[PDB]
Each structure stands twice: as C-alpha cells, then as structure tokens.
C-alpha cells in the first residue's frame, strides 16, 4: 500500500524522528495510523501516536474506535504488513516484529478484511 506519511517525508527525515523518539522514550513505540484506500469509514484526525509498549492491540482498537466514533458492532480491522494482529498482542510485540527501517510501526485500518 501507500502511506501519506511516507509520501510526504523522505526516509532520512522519518528515520531521524523515529530513531530520536526511540531513544528519548524507549518504553514507547511510535506508530503511524492511516485508513485503507476506499474504506467507507471515518478518517483519523491524528495519524501519529506514541503508545506504551505494554498497551494491547485490543486497547488500541478502542482508542481508535473512540477517536473516529465507531461502535463495537462496526467492523474495524488493523493491518500491519498485511496481517491482522490478535487483540492480546502488545504494541511492543507488534513493533518488535513489524517496525520499518525508519523506526516507525505502520498500521492501516479498514472496515473489511481484503
Ligand atoms: Na474489530
Ligand atoms: Ni511533515
Ligand atoms: Ni469527534
């Protein structure tokens, strides 16, 4: 896919900020969250988050649901490198396995599993 954050900032600028955040806040993981193309769901107002490494994927689902005003019955899937993570996984775990070279964890979200 394509993330606007990558499109707007050259790798060197992203890596510089990501690496800096990781040094100043080693207990937190930086994450870029963007909506999947052509997803008929609410768009996010905040694309970058600094979340505690012990925060679970389920808790992050709620954070995002609460921000875009989505109810439980509404479908919302997180995609990280084309993989829908288990809610029991921690953001620290995901980050460790899926973070990119610029030190950021990129998550795409949608209302369908395609
Ligand atoms: Na869900
Ligand atoms: Ni910028
Ligand atoms: Ni609102």
Swiss-Prot record:
Protein modification: The precursor molecule is cleaved by ATG4 (ATG4A, ATG4B, ATG4C or ATG4D) to expose the glycine at the C-terminus and form the cytosolic form, GABARAP-I. The processed form is then activated by APG7L/ATG7, transferred to ATG3 and conjugated to phosphatidylethanolamine (PE) phospholipid to form the membrane-bound form, GABARAP-II. During non-canonical autophagy, the processed form is conjugated to phosphatidylserine (PS) phospholipid. ATG4 proteins also mediate the delipidation of PE-conjugated forms.
Region (Interaction with GABRG2): 36-68
Family classification: Belongs to the ATG8 family.
Gene3D superfamilies in the record: Phosphatidylinositol 3-kinase Catalytic Subunit, Chain A, domain 1
Keyword set, alphabetical order: Apoptosis, Autophagy, Cytoplasm, Cytoplasmic vesicle, Cytoskeleton, Golgi apparatus, Lipoprotein, Membrane, Microtubule, Protein transport, Transport
Oligomeric form and interacting partners: Interacts with GPHN and NSF. Interacts with ATG3, ATG7 and ATG13. Interacts with alpha-tubulin. Interacts with beta-tubulin. Interacts with GABRG2. Interacts with RB1CC1. Interacts with ULK1. Interacts with CALR. Interacts with DDX47. Interacts with TP53INP1 and TP53INP2. Interacts with TBC1D5. Interacts with TBC1D25. Directly interacts with SQSTM1. Interacts with MAPK15. Interacts with TECPR2. Interacts with PCM1. Interacts with TRIM5 and TRIM21. Interacts with MEFV. Interacts with KIF21B.
Region ranges (Interaction with LIR (LC3 nteracting Region) motif of ATG3): 48-50
Chief place of localization: membrane
Region Interaction with beta-tubulin: start-end pairs: 1-22
Coiled coil: none
Biological role: Ubiquitin-like modifier that plays a role in intracellular transport of GABA(A) receptors and its interaction with the cytoskeleton. Involved in autophagy: while LC3s are involved in elongation of the phagophore membrane, the GABARAP/GATE-16 subfamily is essential for a later stage in autophagosome maturation. Through its interaction with the reticulophagy receptor TEX264, participates in the remodeling of subdomains of the endoplasmic reticulum into autophagosomes upon nutrient stress, which then fuse with lysosomes for endoplasmic reticulum turnover.
GO biological process, alphabetically ordered: autophagosome assembly; autophagosome maturation; cellular response to nitrogen starvation; extrinsic apoptotic signaling pathway via death domain receptors; microtubule cytoskeleton organization; mitophagy; positive regulation of proteasomal ubiquitin-dependent protein catabolic process; positive regulation of protein K48-linked ubiquitination
GO CC, any one term: Golgi membrane
InterPro entries named among the record's database cross-references: Atg8-like (IPR004241), Ubiquitin-like_domsf (IPR029071)
Site feature (Interaction with LIR (LC3 nteracting Region) motif of ATG3) residues: 17, 28
UniProt source species: Rattus norvegicus
Full protein name: Gamma-aminobutyric acid receptor-associated protein
Lineage: Eukaryota, Metazoa, Chordata, Craniata, Vertebrata
Localization terms from the record: Cytoplasmic vesicle, Autophagosome membrane; Endomembrane system; Cytoplasm, Cytoskeleton; Golgi apparatus membrane
Tissue specificity statement from the Swiss-Prot or TrEMBL entry: Expressed in brain (at protein level). Can be found in both somatodendritic and axonal compartment of neurons.
One function term, GO molecular function aspect: phosphatidylethanolamine binding
Record region (Interaction with GPHN): 36-114
């Amino acid at each position: 896919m394509k993330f606007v954050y990558k499109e707007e900032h050259p790798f060197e600028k992203r890596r510089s900020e990501g690496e800096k955040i990781r040094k100043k806040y080693p207990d937190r993981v930086p994450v870029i969250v963007e909506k999947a193309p052509k997803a008929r769901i609410g768009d996010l107002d905040k694309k970058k988050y600094l979340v505690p490494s012990d925060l679970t994927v389920g808790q992050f689902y709620f954070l995002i649901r609460k921000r875009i005003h989505l109810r439980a019955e509404d479908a919302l899937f997180f995609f990280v490198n084309n993989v829908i993570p288990p809610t029991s996984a921690t953001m620290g775990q995901l980050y460790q396995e899926h973070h990119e070279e610029d030190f950021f964890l990129y998550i795409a979200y949608s209302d369908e599993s395609v």
